Amino acid sequence: EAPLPQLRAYTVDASWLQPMAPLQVADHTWQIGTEDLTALLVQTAEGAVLLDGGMPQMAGHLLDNMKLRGVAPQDLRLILLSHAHADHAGPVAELKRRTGAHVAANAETAVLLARGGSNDLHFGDGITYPPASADRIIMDGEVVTVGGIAFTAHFMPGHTPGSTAWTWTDTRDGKPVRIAYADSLSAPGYQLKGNPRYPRLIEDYKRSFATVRALPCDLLLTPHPGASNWNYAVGSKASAEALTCNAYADAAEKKFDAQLARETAG
Amino acid sequence: EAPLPQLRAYTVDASWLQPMAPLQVADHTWQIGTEDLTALLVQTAEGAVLLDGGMPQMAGHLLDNMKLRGVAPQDLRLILLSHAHADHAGPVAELKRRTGAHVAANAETAVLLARGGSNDLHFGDGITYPPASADRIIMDGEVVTVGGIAFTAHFMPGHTPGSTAWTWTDTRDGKPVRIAYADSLSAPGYQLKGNPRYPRLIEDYKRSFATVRALPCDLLLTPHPGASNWNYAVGSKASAEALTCNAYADAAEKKFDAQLARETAG
Amino acid sequence: EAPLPQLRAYTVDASWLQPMAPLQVADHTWQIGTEDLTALLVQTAEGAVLLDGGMPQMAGHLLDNMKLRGVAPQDLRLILLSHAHADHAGPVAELKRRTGAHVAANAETAVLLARGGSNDLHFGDGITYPPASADRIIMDGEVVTVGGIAFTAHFMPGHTPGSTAWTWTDTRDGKPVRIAYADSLSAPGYQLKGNPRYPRLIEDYKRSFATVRALPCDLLLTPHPGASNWNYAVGSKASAEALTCNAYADAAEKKFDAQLARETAG
Amino acid sequence: EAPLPQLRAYTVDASWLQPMAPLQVADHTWQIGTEDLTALLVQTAEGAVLLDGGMPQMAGHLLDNMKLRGVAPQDLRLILLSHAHADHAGPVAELKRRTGAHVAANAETAVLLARGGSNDLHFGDGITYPPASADRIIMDGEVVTVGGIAFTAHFMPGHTPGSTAWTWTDTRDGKPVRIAYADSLSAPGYQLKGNPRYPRLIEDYKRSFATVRALPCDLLLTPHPGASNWNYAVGSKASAEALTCNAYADAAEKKFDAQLARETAG
Ligand SMILES: OC[C@H]1O[C@@](CO)(O[C@H]2O[C@H](CO)[C@@H](O)[C@H](O)[C@H]2O)[C@@H](O)[C@@H]1O
Ligand SMILES: OC[C@H]1O[C@@](CO)(O[C@H]2O[C@H](CO)[C@@H](O)[C@H](O)[C@H]2O)[C@@H](O)[C@@H]1O
Ligand SMILES: OC[C@H]1O[C@@](CO)(O[C@H]2O[C@H](CO)[C@@H](O)[C@H](O)[C@H]2O)[C@@H](O)[C@@H]1O
Ligand SMILES: OC[C@H]1O[C@@](CO)(O[C@H]2O[C@H](CO)[C@@H](O)[C@H](O)[C@H]2O)[C@@H](O)[C@@H]1O
Ligand SMILES: OC[C@H]1O[C@@](CO)(O[C@H]2O[C@H](CO)[C@@H](O)[C@H](O)[C@H]2O)[C@@H](O)[C@@H]1O
Ligand SMILES: OC[C@H]1O[C@@](CO)(O[C@H]2O[C@H](CO)[C@@H](O)[C@H](O)[C@H]2O)[C@@H](O)[C@@H]1O
Ligand SMILES: OC[C@H]1O[C@@](CO)(O[C@H]2O[C@H](CO)[C@@H](O)[C@H](O)[C@H]2O)[C@@H](O)[C@@H]1O
Ligand SMILES: OC[C@H]1O[C@@](CO)(O[C@H]2O[C@H](CO)[C@@H](O)[C@H](O)[C@H]2O)[C@@H](O)[C@@H]1O
Ligand SMILES: [Zn+2]
Ligand SMILES: [Zn+2]
Ligand SMILES: [Zn+2]
Ligand SMILES: [Zn+2]
Ligand SMILES: [Zn+2]
Ligand SMILES: [Zn+2]
Ligand SMILES: [Zn+2]
Ligand SMILES: [Zn+2]
Ligand SMILES: [Zn+2]
Ligand SMILES: [Zn+2]
Ligand SMILES: [Zn+2]
Ligand SMILES: [Zn+2]
């Protein structure tokens, strides 16, 4: 009688899809995504690095903003990721096809990216995107260097098994600024306790809060800017209310502890 | 001002998603998909073969019908495909996870399946599904045998580069019936002439019409039953109006020639 | 003048390639590899599991011993691995082609297996084997069940990033025996300190010694039987001198500490 | 009693491993491989293309010759292949890691490259190399353009299913020269007739001879220079005795016909 349900698209708040002009974060580092999704362009003498790309439909916008910054498609050398969900790695496959970029990621992120976010530990097949391959597998603490800028990977599993914080030192008019691009610490709708697909989930989150607290962190950014209290829409004041890494980890742990207590109740 | 567009789901006619009970095609062969999408179960002494699975959301229905036929999940040994579009290979990844099945397919089908139908030559990223890996690569004319039933692959590129017809001989109360499961010969919205992503498209279709004409073909079935004039909803009369392979290829070539003439006009 | 060097084969001690008849370890568990490489067959009512396969050239021998145990190729349901080096995962690709088996492994093991052991963190391309794909990705502590026998994964990174101990409870004439198949803890020729390809190597080994100490462990086996003092060549006395998990971890840590001190010296 | 055999390395004639300085073929095109294996560097205003790399151990030599030509590792934009055997695609994985290059290849070549030449239709696992992934899948007749130089793919299956001829137009002091890099047409030790792994092998070779005859072909080069009568070791006279595409196809077909007759005899 009833047919099987139609496929449902992954739809998001309009602000996550609202294009913005490039916003300078430090001397070499620019936010080039949307008002509510981070995509960081780091420009060096020997090419550019992109950290995250946002949603699948953002590929053209990212290339447009790269061109505004003077980065031709072939000048993009490397793509790094916070984690391989559709709202952060969405356009990676298309960006690889349209640029000279390689992708570097840890093994967990590589296997999730290669299945386009399908068979997610918590989302199943509900939130997917075009698959892409990682060209370089990185280990915890490994340094990736482009044009002399060194990016250090800090694994912080929990939100995904492959969740990664990336740190690098830029300058603000020549003076060092230690940037920490810390991954999400949310657990949206997750089963936290006794999860057969992620048995050590709680232990991983708890260690990840400590990892984030200890990051070198003059300036924190996050894949969802609201998580670190950034306001990309207000330009020069965008960073004014930004959290420290310590405060971001503390807020995330308090939310996590409350969610765990509610799960025990329900 | 305007945000980027939301992602759009691949939605289809309700009849493509309308479950049906198993319909016997020959002694060992059953249609177990929906009223308007073919999924053929061939049952042998040494396990079962599935030819196509339909849409991604059909995985549970297929397993239900397998159980009605006496095929436990671990009894499914092999998945074969007509072509790797979402409406025929949709549930392959999930079926592999939930059964003991391997997938056998040609290289073109394997590479399209492995990217979940993304970066399609004609559809781009508009019609995708969870990626799956082929476990065995097959060549044109290669025979795959399960439980003594021999399935022969006949490449018929055009609708996709990897489009394949599968033939086998079943029985009807012990008497031989040469079954031809011929792939689609449609070109829905395709640019046929001077296509930079498929320069020899017209030559491939034209050869594929000839391939289909020559198939051993007592009984023709097609991924979309309407293409061969099957009527799955009427049970015992389902095959009554079915086309021959010759008539199917002729109708497809006439449609193709008309579409090519219209493309030249527009 | 001098040509580039010829490729060099991965050659091993003859005892690693010396076939042996199946040796019973417990009611359902058999050593079916060679005198000096472990390959464990666990036989259940609903099919068999293979833990490791040894060297690439052992595939036929493994299938022979499976047949002696009553396991037809299609009865092999699952392959599990200690780690994805050529002397333990060597024949996995061929076994998958010749049996109905899937492979389950963590993400690190999956990415190393998929490149056939090439670009190894320590061996480069010197020790490789035919690539294979993991069909199921498992997380730390995840339970995989076949025929009612539950196998629990315990990650113990160091020898490879994906190194895994597998535990299960068998019986000895109906009485429970907790088997621990603990991975290698060696670091043959490895740079341990300040390794840019594995920055947290020492921390991972140190945690892995503790993981092995805590395993449920009535009977310890290891990929190289000599590491746990097994003597496969003497049949019924093969397990007589076997180490406990505690003693295996202690011996490995003492060796590791000495090697680290020598590396600091040299 | 007897242990299983040791693994055997793929060893080749010394001349295949004999490094040579870059040899100019046309204004933009250089032979940069060894005396007996072709590796063509095409240098454009917008980066370089490499067609084949030879044996796995040639990676460093190729990078050295690129540097002599003024091509830094990051200037290599694209790798194209004749076919994915160890003596032509051997160093592709390492070159991708050490350069900015992507690989473009047809689906058949991509699936063979991704398993490192293992499970070869004729060689089994005897001739393998580190696996690499194709970043772009190309179709027959598709044009790939770098720095304004257009490379056209011409499929010529037989030696491998994915065998490809690549054509482009260079200049000799400004005057057009149509270069044809035609793949191997040998069948070394192959079973040609009734091959269950390649049922249409003879038909594919026969069509491939015709494909090679029709190539735009002012100057023919081949993966093994001896096949087209090149003499890389004599510098300026290297091309003097080179065959036409017509003569290369004719010689290959005569050899093929004789081998087929001998196979029928034996
Ligand atoms: O790398 C040390 C550096 O990090 C900062 C924050 O940028 O301090 C963080 O790290 C310290 C050691 O891990 C912690 O004591 C501190 O709580 C944490 O914020 C800088 O203060 C310090 O120079
Ligand atoms: O979610 C952060 C994102 O929201 C915007 C509005 O689109 O700013 C809001 O959130 C900021 C804190 O994260 C507030 O300071 C601001 O007042 C509020 O409008 C974006 O600008 C910001 O990137
Ligand atoms: O395999 C031959 C077999 O096929 C049939 C149809 O089932 O005929 C088809 O193939 C013939 C040769 O390819 C064609 O002459 C014919 O037009 C085509 O239908 C049977 O008639 C025949 O026994
Ligand atoms: O598209 C074929 C598919 O449509 C159904 C109705 O759901 O049957 C229709 O098409 C048949 C020919 O293909 C007609 O004979 C029939 O009268 C018409 O309703 C399905 O039954 C059939 O599988
Ligand atoms: O799972 C507990 C079980 O393991 C054994 C060994 O088989 O003890 C091991 O684990 C204990 C807790 O992790 C440790 O105290 C002990 O040192 C270690 O050997 C059994 O004794 C126990 O029943
Ligand atoms: O390396 C273990 C492996 O070696 C053999 C001989 O081939 O046995 C040796 O090692 C045993 C301890 O691991 C000793 O007890 C034995 O005396 C010695 O010969 C194999 O039997 C064993 O599997
Ligand atoms: O593309 C035509 C061009 O190719 C040449 C050889 O470079 O001729 C080849 O192709 C012709 C048509 O395919 C054949 O007639 C000829 O035999 C073959 O060598 C040039 O002669 C011609 O300009
Ligand atoms: O196999 C071709 C390859 O061999 C060399 C010698 O290393 O040259 C030989 O083959 C040429 C024809 O292909 C002959 O003309 C030459 O006289 C002979 O030495 C290499 O120079 C050539 O690249
Ligand atoms: Zn400045
Ligand atoms: Zn997320
Ligand atoms: Zn998110
Ligand atoms: Zn019957
Ligand atoms: Zn289709
Ligand atoms: Zn369809
Ligand atoms: Zn018993
Ligand atoms: Zn090892
Ligand atoms: Zn080992
Ligand atoms: Zn010049
Ligand atoms: Zn070859
Ligand atoms: Zn060759």
mmCIF file with all atom_site columns, C-alpha atoms in Angstrom, chain D residues 147-214:
data_model
loop_
_atom_site.group_PDB
_atom_site.id
_atom_site.type_symbol
_atom_site.label_atom_id
_atom_site.label_alt_id
_atom_site.label_comp_id
_atom_site.label_asym_id
_atom_site.label_entity_id
_atom_site.label_seq_id
_atom_site.pdbx_PDB_ins_code
_atom_site.Cartn_x
_atom_site.Cartn_y
_atom_site.Cartn_z
_atom_site.occupancy
_atom_site.B_iso_or_equiv
_atom_site.pdbx_formal_charge
_atom_site.auth_seq_id
_atom_site.auth_comp_id
_atom_site.auth_asym_id
_atom_site.auth_atom_id
_atom_site.pdbx_PDB_model_num
ATOM 1  C CA . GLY D 1 147 ? 49.458 24.617  -20.441 1.00 0.00 ? 147 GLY D CA 1
ATOM 2  C CA . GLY D 1 148 ? 47.606 24.627  -23.740 1.00 0.00 ? 148 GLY D CA 1
ATOM 3  C CA . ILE D 1 149 ? 49.058 21.301  -24.931 1.00 0.00 ? 149 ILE D CA 1
ATOM 4  C CA . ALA D 1 150 ? 46.230 18.884  -25.719 1.00 0.00 ? 150 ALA D CA 1
ATOM 5  C CA . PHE D 1 151 ? 46.761 15.143  -25.141 1.00 0.00 ? 151 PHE D CA 1
ATOM 6  C CA . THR D 1 152 ? 44.212 12.810  -26.753 1.00 0.00 ? 152 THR D CA 1
ATOM 7  C CA . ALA D 1 153 ? 43.651 9.285   -25.422 1.00 0.00 ? 153 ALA D CA 1
ATOM 8  C CA . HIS D 1 154 ? 43.185 6.430   -27.912 1.00 0.00 ? 154 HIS D CA 1
ATOM 9  C CA . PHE D 1 155 ? 42.222 3.151   -26.261 1.00 0.00 ? 155 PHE D CA 1
ATOM 10 C CA . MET D 1 156 ? 44.109 0.154   -27.658 1.00 0.00 ? 156 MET D CA 1
ATOM 11 C CA . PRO D 1 157 ? 43.272 -2.758  -25.362 1.00 0.00 ? 157 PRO D CA 1
ATOM 12 C CA . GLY D 1 158 ? 45.108 -6.048  -25.544 1.00 0.00 ? 158 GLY D CA 1
ATOM 13 C CA . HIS D 1 159 ? 48.463 -5.925  -23.808 1.00 0.00 ? 159 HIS D CA 1
ATOM 14 C CA . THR D 1 160 ? 46.356 -4.775  -20.853 1.00 0.00 ? 160 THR D CA 1
ATOM 15 C CA . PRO D 1 161 ? 42.618 -4.024  -20.964 1.00 0.00 ? 161 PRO D CA 1
ATOM 16 C CA . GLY D 1 162 ? 43.449 -0.388  -20.247 1.00 0.00 ? 162 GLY D CA 1
ATOM 17 C CA . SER D 1 163 ? 46.265 0.050   -22.766 1.00 0.00 ? 163 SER D CA 1
ATOM 18 C CA . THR D 1 164 ? 46.213 3.589   -24.168 1.00 0.00 ? 164 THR D CA 1
ATOM 19 C CA . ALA D 1 165 ? 47.977 5.512   -26.915 1.00 0.00 ? 165 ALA D CA 1
ATOM 20 C CA . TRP D 1 166 ? 48.481 9.227   -26.215 1.00 0.00 ? 166 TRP D CA 1
ATOM 21 C CA . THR D 1 167 ? 48.842 11.758  -29.023 1.00 0.00 ? 167 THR D CA 1
ATOM 22 C CA . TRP D 1 168 ? 49.772 15.424  -29.025 1.00 0.00 ? 168 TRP D CA 1
ATOM 23 C CA . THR D 1 169 ? 51.201 17.982  -31.412 1.00 0.00 ? 169 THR D CA 1
ATOM 24 C CA . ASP D 1 170 ? 54.542 19.543  -30.465 1.00 0.00 ? 170 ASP D CA 1
ATOM 25 C CA . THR D 1 171 ? 56.841 21.658  -32.640 1.00 0.00 ? 171 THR D CA 1
ATOM 26 C CA . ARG D 1 172 ? 60.351 21.244  -34.021 1.00 0.00 ? 172 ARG D CA 1
ATOM 27 C CA . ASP D 1 173 ? 61.699 24.805  -34.013 1.00 0.00 ? 173 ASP D CA 1
ATOM 28 C CA . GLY D 1 174 ? 58.144 26.106  -34.205 1.00 0.00 ? 174 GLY D CA 1
ATOM 29 C CA . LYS D 1 175 ? 56.856 23.639  -36.917 1.00 0.00 ? 175 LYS D CA 1
ATOM 30 C CA . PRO D 1 176 ? 54.165 21.072  -36.013 1.00 0.00 ? 176 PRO D CA 1
ATOM 31 C CA . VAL D 1 177 ? 55.121 17.474  -35.219 1.00 0.00 ? 177 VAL D CA 1
ATOM 32 C CA . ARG D 1 178 ? 52.323 15.038  -34.406 1.00 0.00 ? 178 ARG D CA 1
ATOM 33 C CA . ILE D 1 179 ? 53.704 12.739  -31.697 1.00 0.00 ? 179 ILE D CA 1
ATOM 34 C CA . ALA D 1 180 ? 52.132 9.336   -31.065 1.00 0.00 ? 180 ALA D CA 1
ATOM 35 C CA . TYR D 1 181 ? 53.081 7.542   -27.845 1.00 0.00 ? 181 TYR D CA 1
ATOM 36 C CA . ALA D 1 182 ? 51.596 4.149   -28.708 1.00 0.00 ? 182 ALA D CA 1
ATOM 37 C CA . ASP D 1 183 ? 51.347 1.440   -26.077 1.00 0.00 ? 183 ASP D CA 1
ATOM 38 C CA . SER D 1 184 ? 52.842 -2.042  -26.233 1.00 0.00 ? 184 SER D CA 1
ATOM 39 C CA . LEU D 1 185 ? 51.225 -4.579  -28.570 1.00 0.00 ? 185 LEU D CA 1
ATOM 40 C CA . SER D 1 186 ? 53.133 -7.595  -27.218 1.00 0.00 ? 186 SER D CA 1
ATOM 41 C CA . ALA D 1 187 ? 51.492 -10.596 -25.565 1.00 0.00 ? 187 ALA D CA 1
ATOM 42 C CA . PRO D 1 188 ? 54.404 -12.050 -23.553 1.00 0.00 ? 188 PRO D CA 1
ATOM 43 C CA . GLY D 1 189 ? 53.489 -15.581 -22.524 1.00 0.00 ? 189 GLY D CA 1
ATOM 44 C CA . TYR D 1 190 ? 49.780 -14.797 -22.821 1.00 0.00 ? 190 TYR D CA 1
ATOM 45 C CA . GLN D 1 191 ? 47.115 -17.382 -23.482 1.00 0.00 ? 191 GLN D CA 1
ATOM 46 C CA . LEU D 1 192 ? 45.427 -15.731 -26.470 1.00 0.00 ? 192 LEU D CA 1
ATOM 47 C CA . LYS D 1 193 ? 42.612 -18.141 -27.384 1.00 0.00 ? 193 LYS D CA 1
ATOM 48 C CA . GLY D 1 194 ? 39.734 -19.122 -25.109 1.00 0.00 ? 194 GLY D CA 1
ATOM 49 C CA . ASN D 1 195 ? 41.150 -17.181 -22.184 1.00 0.00 ? 195 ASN D CA 1
ATOM 50 C CA . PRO D 1 196 ? 38.481 -17.223 -19.446 1.00 0.00 ? 196 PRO D CA 1
ATOM 51 C CA . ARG D 1 197 ? 39.907 -14.063 -17.874 1.00 0.00 ? 197 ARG D CA 1
ATOM 52 C CA . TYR D 1 198 ? 39.958 -12.209 -21.226 1.00 0.00 ? 198 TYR D CA 1
ATOM 53 C CA . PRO D 1 199 ? 37.440 -13.825 -23.595 1.00 0.00 ? 199 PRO D CA 1
ATOM 54 C CA . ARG D 1 200 ? 37.647 -11.150 -26.332 1.00 0.00 ? 200 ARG D CA 1
ATOM 55 C CA . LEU D 1 201 ? 41.430 -10.764 -26.228 1.00 0.00 ? 201 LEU D CA 1
ATOM 56 C CA . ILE D 1 202 ? 41.984 -11.593 -29.914 1.00 0.00 ? 202 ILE D CA 1
ATOM 57 C CA . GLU D 1 203 ? 39.249 -9.209  -31.073 1.00 0.00 ? 203 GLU D CA 1
ATOM 58 C CA . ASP D 1 204 ? 40.697 -6.428  -28.909 1.00 0.00 ? 204 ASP D CA 1
ATOM 59 C CA . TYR D 1 205 ? 44.251 -6.860  -30.240 1.00 0.00 ? 205 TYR D CA 1
ATOM 60 C CA . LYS D 1 206 ? 42.986 -6.952  -33.824 1.00 0.00 ? 206 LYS D CA 1
ATOM 61 C CA . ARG D 1 207 ? 41.041 -3.730  -33.379 1.00 0.00 ? 207 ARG D CA 1
ATOM 62 C CA . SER D 1 208 ? 44.034 -2.217  -31.589 1.00 0.00 ? 208 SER D CA 1
ATOM 63 C CA . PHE D 1 209 ? 46.338 -2.838  -34.561 1.00 0.00 ? 209 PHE D CA 1
ATOM 64 C CA . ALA D 1 210 ? 43.868 -0.818  -36.640 1.00 0.00 ? 210 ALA D CA 1
ATOM 65 C CA . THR D 1 211 ? 43.719 1.929   -34.006 1.00 0.00 ? 211 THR D CA 1
ATOM 66 C CA . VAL D 1 212 ? 47.498 2.295   -34.047 1.00 0.00 ? 212 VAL D CA 1
ATOM 67 C CA . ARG D 1 213 ? 47.609 2.356   -37.870 1.00 0.00 ? 213 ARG D CA 1
ATOM 68 C CA . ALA D 1 214 ? 45.232 5.323   -37.924 1.00 0.00 ? 214 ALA D CA 1
#
